[PDB]
């Protein structure tokens, strides 16, 4: 077995099948920065750090040495524990097609959630510098009318072009942003429309950012390191319920600070 | 023979092609929900319910004993008789294409309401629940100008992505706003094309139901359990008449309370 | 893995099979609807109602439309939770050969005569009308005298060749008059011997019923529709005990009103 005891859990096959599926579409569905970062491949659990090249003075230990310590990224593991009810799993066997899956729904929205500010909002608890902190473009504001949005969509682009990068342009909206700029039709068109129309790449849904993020998706600038992809695991149970997990271990590194433009308000 | 006795009925082989094609043609016509619903194989004269795989608290027997009910919803059988005059019937042979097919139509389209109705706004006495109450999103209301309706449209699918839902969208139109949004036009287009191009799915014309629906067509959400497909039956005849009817046996489900948005007035 | 898990029960195979052999023995010993009336192959979890291919006249949605609801009788789970020495279950690794299984037998026993009970005497709770009641030939009463049990056997014999049924016949004791005609002898045999010669079938012992049952075994009066037969699960366990539970889901349906007659008294 590894940790993730699921040998060990009172669940089904065909309840793990449909818990599996719930879990993986929510987190597609949930998911903004895997679209256009690069995500390495997993590590595996052994992975603990990611090397970024660099050397750190230290205090040499006797004379005449020169030390240098060898910089690293350590990765994050972030578990999000979730129960369900033992009845629908259960009711998975004798033919049950609405099984109550929301716990694993809210968790896996929770993981991408987390997966996606830690992206682009950072967490420094883990020394992870997110895309907004780390680009060294100017960083805008979004208007509150939803129609001048493309205005400053072009103000981004047009920095991002100052900035001498290339690749196709992708934008980020927060729900809000993504929301007003859906209900909102201009001559006949939604502002999602003109959005699109203005970049070559795609305006991506991203519930967990906050503002709108314009970035270039050429690749080599934003690296996902994975150490384990997302997993459920087994924690306990109960008669009636069992407690499990959606966990992953993860971090970012920005490479190119002039890739990414931030908006805000 | 079987429930249909087809053999019995004094209707030649030339005019039951014709009656079987209009039936089929009408029905095909007036149907909405075998669009968007998945439609199961037909299980046989025999399946009387579909089981739901959950359990019903009974009063034990004897003590020391659990028991519990198997769940199960009752299909229920419609039928929709309908008179042919027997020289439009006899006519068919003679080489008459205008045969008066219209009791044909009437009781196909009938039926096809009867289905959409049952699907979408329910049949209680069934032990059917139909997509508007099994709705959890919030139910919206279409404004009285047709060119407000690409707003409440943009509302809903907002809605259906705050619920996390995937898949292609589609939106069912009552006979009166199908009408209003057909022949009112913006932007030199018609506001039936605004809302084709809000969704990626289609447009459909759903007489039956009141009000819209947005929904997903991803799959696994609205489960339409067929007993046996529509049937054209014998019952009687006189010397100038022949008493048939149109019949179908089916129960409706739906599995996912968020995949679907209800709009009214 | 399925609901029964077994795989997380703290049970060994030999210990599993000592517990499967015991729980057979018994339930085979203790059983007598089996014996009489037609046993079904188990239909699956899933299975949850079973057609009686009759309507049911409901109040039609729309007008010019006649709706039925498919008639179906409903499977009834039933559990019989029992406990077991975890030593005991140790020791049959250790070679010993008189494990404690008395929880397996009560539970076992207890199984057999509810399903018997509802067989025979009905179970109202799950829709279910007994041999008892469903039985159109007049009730006999039997007498206190052992002696004079084959006068109202032969009297049932008489009703059943006056309601025109054919077949083999065998009687159902209950324990108390099983006992009362095996303790009972005259003219040096066994009242038992008596309605064994009576009859061309079998004298069935019936712990689980009341009074005595004669029926014809033709076949195709009695179904027992089993939706999974009689199973061993796992609940949960402590340091020193298991708590497992034998379970099935069944129904009966009687088909011939006159192939049976009760006795009671």
Partial sequence: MNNLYRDLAPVTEAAWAEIELEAARTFKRHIAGRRVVDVSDPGGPVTAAVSTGRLIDVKAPTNGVIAHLRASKPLVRLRVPFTLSRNEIDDVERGSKDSDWEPVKEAAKKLAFVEDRTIFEGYSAASIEGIRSASSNPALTLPEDPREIPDVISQALSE?????????????????????????????????????????????????????????????????????????????????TVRLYLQETLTFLCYTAEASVALSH
């Fill in 160 to 240: 991002l072009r100052l900035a001498g990068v290339d690749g196709p342009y992708s934008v980020l909206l927060s729900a809000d942003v993504y929301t007003k700029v859906s209900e909102t039709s201009d001559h006949g068109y939604p502002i999602r429309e003109h959005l699109n129309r203005l970049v070559d790449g795609d305006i991506i849904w991203a519930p967990a950012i906050d503002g709108a993020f314009v970035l270039t998706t050429r690749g080599g600038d934003f690296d996902l390191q994975l150490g384990t992809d997302v997993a459920i695991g087994y924690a306990s149970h109960d008669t009636d």
